Amino acid sequence: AAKDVKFGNDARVKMLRGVNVLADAVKVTLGPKGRNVVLDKSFGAPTITKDGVSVAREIELEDKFENMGAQMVKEVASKANDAAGDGTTTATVLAQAIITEGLKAVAAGMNPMDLKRGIDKAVTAAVEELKALSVPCSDSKAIAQVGTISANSDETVGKLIAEAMDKVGKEGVITVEDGTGLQDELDVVEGMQFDRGYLSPYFINKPETGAVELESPFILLADKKISNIREMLPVLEAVAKAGKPLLIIAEDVEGEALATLVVNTMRGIVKVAAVKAPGFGDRRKAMLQDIATLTGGTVISEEIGMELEKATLEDLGQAKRVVINKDTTTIIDGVGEEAAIQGRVAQIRQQIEEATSDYDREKLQERVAKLAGGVAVIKVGAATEVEMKEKKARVEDALHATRAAVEEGVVAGGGVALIRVASKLADLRGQNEDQNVGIKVALRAMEAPLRQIVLNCGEEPSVVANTVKGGDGNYGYNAATEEYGNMIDMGILDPTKVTRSALQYAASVAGLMITTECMVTDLP
């Protein structure tokens, strides 16, 4: 009800307190020794988690000041989680440290905008320097190391995912959820596939247990419920002389058509199987074109230069085998020319950039996997649904890490690359001594995530930080192994994407928000 507008240091204190409270809540919880926080949901039991995005999304307390502070810091965390999912606290820690330094600078009375500009130029330069420091990540050993890092020192997960991507190739796409059981199961979807069962239980063909496998078949497409008398008379007769099994991808089937297909098949007349509409309108059509390219066939409907009832036998598709069961239907090695493959690849290239962005590129990658690659699903089983959610989050983080390593490679882990580039870029100079001071203080505050990681390890940050400044190259401390030496030889590796994006977004947002001089809020 009441309003509250304050200015300068008045709002500065409130924002500092909110940031400090959020930091106390968040920063200590990252890393191996960093622990898990519970987020309450109204209807049922609360969820235990470590992810920064979940924590930030759940942030809501009585105090409006910290409330809106969390609201405005949530955007950078969301951006980084859409990028990385891990090392959000580090970006937050960076922001908090440079906010304190901005408090120091405004105590010095500086213009915040010039400070932000100089620090942002320094951030850019650090971005190119990080790109230079990047080392390619190719070997599956490095893949397993980075995956274990992403799973927070879980070698079982790292080896599992490394072997999985080795078997499915770099082209294998992954969309995974665990089953009811506790067993870790790897399933690979090869080529064209949809999880579809029998339209009629009469569909029991030669394979037992209701299994259906037909080799060298003729694949028909149906625009709608065929009607007429069993439709496709010339094609049916040609198959009758041919004697090969028939497959149908039907939008809809007459009940009488279903009955006469039953008669034809299980009287031994002709081997015919039919499947329902695979997908949604203009989407099922899209996959119809895709499978026509895949199997070297053509979409069979009246909507092409010929009509459905009377047509040429060339319209049908062909494949090495088809597997239709009570649950799933799959195409084994359809014969389509590589020229059509490249045409579909060019269409994929066109559809790569999308204004819808999300769910369009993943549909395109679904097409990619169905045409050349494959789908990998590893049901990692355990007791509690919270633990499965944690495992899947770590799995997708490792997947994104693998993507970054393949596309670009990795850099040194543990932020030793951070302190290295901080040392290397210290002497850069700007328009004024003021900008230089702002850049210097940002550089000093940048180590805060590393010293906080040390604090999380229950260790003194001063000693290790100063020693790290003393040493060079790969010299760094592994608190988990409690040893100085080479991080790369230890295999501590960070994707360039996560560090680069986190630093960019956190620095930009903190530099822009620290310029504030007035604030408005509503209190009860």
Added chain:
Amino acid sequence: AAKDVKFGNDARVKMLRGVNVLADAVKVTLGPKGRNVVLDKSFGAPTITKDGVSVAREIELEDKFENMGAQMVKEVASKANDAAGDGTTTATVLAQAIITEGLKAVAAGMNPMDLKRGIDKAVTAAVEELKALSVPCSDSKAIAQVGTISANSDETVGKLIAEAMDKVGKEGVITVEDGTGLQDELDVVEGMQFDRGYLSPYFINKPETGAVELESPFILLADKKISNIREMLPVLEAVAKAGKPLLIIAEDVEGEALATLVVNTMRGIVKVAAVKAPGFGDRRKAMLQDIATLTGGTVISEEIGMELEKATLEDLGQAKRVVINKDTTTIIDGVGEEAAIQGRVAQIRQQIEEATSDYDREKLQERVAKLAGGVAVIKVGAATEVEMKEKKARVEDALHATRAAVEEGVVAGGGVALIRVASKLADLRGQNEDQNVGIKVALRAMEAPLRQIVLNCGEEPSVVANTVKGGDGNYGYNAATEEYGNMIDMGILDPTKVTRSALQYAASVAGLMITTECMVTDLP
């Protein structure tokens, strides 16, 4: 209402006290000295229950942290009830012990994930060794013994359950039904049964009490509603000249066909009873083959080349006798080769274990028993609804114990094998000292269930602990009768599955608990 944050041990103490209250409530319900607890119920009178899950589902504590800790520990109790039905008490006492161990270890500041790894290694070794000590015990004597033990030493119930299993066979199902009188009753009825009376009362046979017994009945399979078409007359005449009763099992019948059938029966040509199909279209279709193979027939339906309009007398199934009454219509016995039933039973054995779990299992084993076993009906001899529920729950517990014994077997109860394996696993070691002390933590915490068992008599546990530690093998103590001896000789046993599941779930919830550091909750 207003949201707030708490950190670590301070709220951990509140959760400790809440779970302490919960465990105190739980303790008074386990064992022969376990007593019954009142749970206020709004709909009627409060429920007086010994069941752990019944209490658990209605748990709510005034404090936020205590209530939420109860919510997290509710998952393990729920899943244990779903798997076994009891043993929630031992999970709770294990939880209390491990919480004490963990809180004092954090007071030591000790490493969480090393403790979790040590607990997991100990759990793996425990599972391996308990599977090793599993002893083949399938004698019906031991079956009656475990039934009596699970029946809280009720020889009547245990003998009833053993007789029910023997009459239905090893794989035959045993079902629990409501009971009004004070004497237990067990009835076995064979054949396919449903809650259908003869659609017209005039279809009653000569015996009174609504009895319609047809000897050497023959089975008709009509996919559709055929009364209106009225074209079955040639097949009816074939049955009439065969001088046999035909039995109509069709989707529906109208008044015209029913009336002319009534006139045909009273004029004395052929005595015929007609019943509509029991279940759903998929379900009716599925049971069609079941009854046909039972009666030696093939599925007669309208959606294949053959049709009900033109049929041969040999198309029908054969049976010994059918009993039809206003309560149930049943076929006692069919006439068919059992090879087809066995093969389809195997192809459904493939279908049995699914992620579907609930909502399908009932139909699955009812189908299996109807194909193979018999129908068992149990009338409970208790007086009130709470007593109904208590012995009925004991019945499913005894059934689960039979399942575990049949599949894998059991071991000695009371945790004697537990203390033995703990004593011989004293030197189990982990990766480092933290894991070793976590192994010690598991070693001490697994003692909590047994000391709680001894304290359940209101008597000091350390005496029995020392005596059992001094003893070896199956040496043990009876707290129900309170004397020492051989654990096998006193004859209380534990199925392997329930203990393995309890320990696994307890380890999981321990690993979850040890990672708790912060919370956001509400204050009214």
Added chain:
Amino acid sequence: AAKDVKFGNDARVKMLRGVNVLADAVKVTLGPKGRNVVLDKSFGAPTITKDGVSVAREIELEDKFENMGAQMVKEVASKANDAAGDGTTTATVLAQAIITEGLKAVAAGMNPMDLKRGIDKAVTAAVEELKALSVPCSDSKAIAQVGTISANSDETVGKLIAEAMDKVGKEGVITVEDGTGLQDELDVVEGMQFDRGYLSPYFINKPETGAVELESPFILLADKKISNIREMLPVLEAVAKAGKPLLIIAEDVEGEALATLVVNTMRGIVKVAAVKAPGFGDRRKAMLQDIATLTGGTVISEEIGMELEKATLEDLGQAKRVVINKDTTTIIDGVGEEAAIQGRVAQIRQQIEEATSDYDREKLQERVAKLAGGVAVIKVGAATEVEMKEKKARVEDALHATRAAVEEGVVAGGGVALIRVASKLADLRGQNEDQNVGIKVALRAMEAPLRQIVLNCGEEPSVVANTVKGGDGNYGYNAATEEYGNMIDMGILDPTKVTRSALQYAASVAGLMITTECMVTDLP
């Protein structure tokens, strides 16, 4: 009545609250970066002060828990004020160090009693090592250095104190009293000077000063007030033959006595002046004997058998010259051989070394210094009351430093010797592991000086401490300039007794608090 009992951590948390508040209050002041604290006064102005004890001893906190915390922590500060005067901040930071690591040790479950025993034995060993490393201070340069450093680096007053101490000798007694101008004034009082002034105005012998210079007068000491006789002829006539002036010292002066002597003064026979004794009967009698002996005279004793009629040149006292004014009376020199002089001084110091330590004994050493050497008096004035109080506190600290230097000298200061001896202190072992942990607590504790100096300086503590520990002897880090190098060149030295007593009493008292298991207090 009002009761409130806290057990274990219940009391602990409130203790941690009070101790944290007190430590925050104390840490502000020490070092060149240390600031002042307000000692608010309801009536007059507060005191803006730097001395930790000057704050703590007089400060009381109204809230209950902080009230108890201050109550238990204030006795050590009070005794330090009574004995040491400075370093109370250092002993305070030591107290927090030891209680902090003690409460974590308790959290570890370690035996408090053995911990305290090991701490006590290590304190004894540290005392031994301090005595071994004790170095005397003899040169006036180092004396001035340590005096200035104890005086918070006020060079002018420190060198003033050093030179005045040189003037008054090693045994001479030095006192500080209030002045008027901003500049401290040095006063050297030689011989017997006592606060007694002339009564009748005609006593003015030398004008413009009120000062009476007597030409070797015939000093008489009287314990009787001359009222009755009005006839001092036995001594008056002897003086008449002598022809020299005379001085009178009496218990009291009657109007009769004043009348007769004033008549004599206008008569001009000899210069006649009579003065009362300075203090109360016992004290004035006590100085009567020493005045007589150092002047070689005899006090007339009316409680012993003799009177003025029996008088001779040795009966009546003599001194070479005296000075008399309206305020005080001084003796430049008296006729007394050193044998009996220091015989009386020796018998005085025999009883001088008693648990007295009170104002009477302090002015007794003042009288002794008058007997043998000279007395120093420092007139301290300043612009405002708080400035005067600061100067008084700093001068008192410098006086304590001079005491320590004179008695034994001073040892390495700034806590450097503390860490140096703690380096060798690791060799100590106890009865068992509990005592070993108690000893190595002393290792974790002696960093209170280094972390507090760094906390004041706002620098990196850990590597600074480690590098200084790498150095030895005169090497260290100066906070006043904040650079490494030789310290003993600057004369940075701590008194032996102050540091030793502080450390041992603090260890004892904080060890006795840290073993507390329960507390009882009063409700509001």
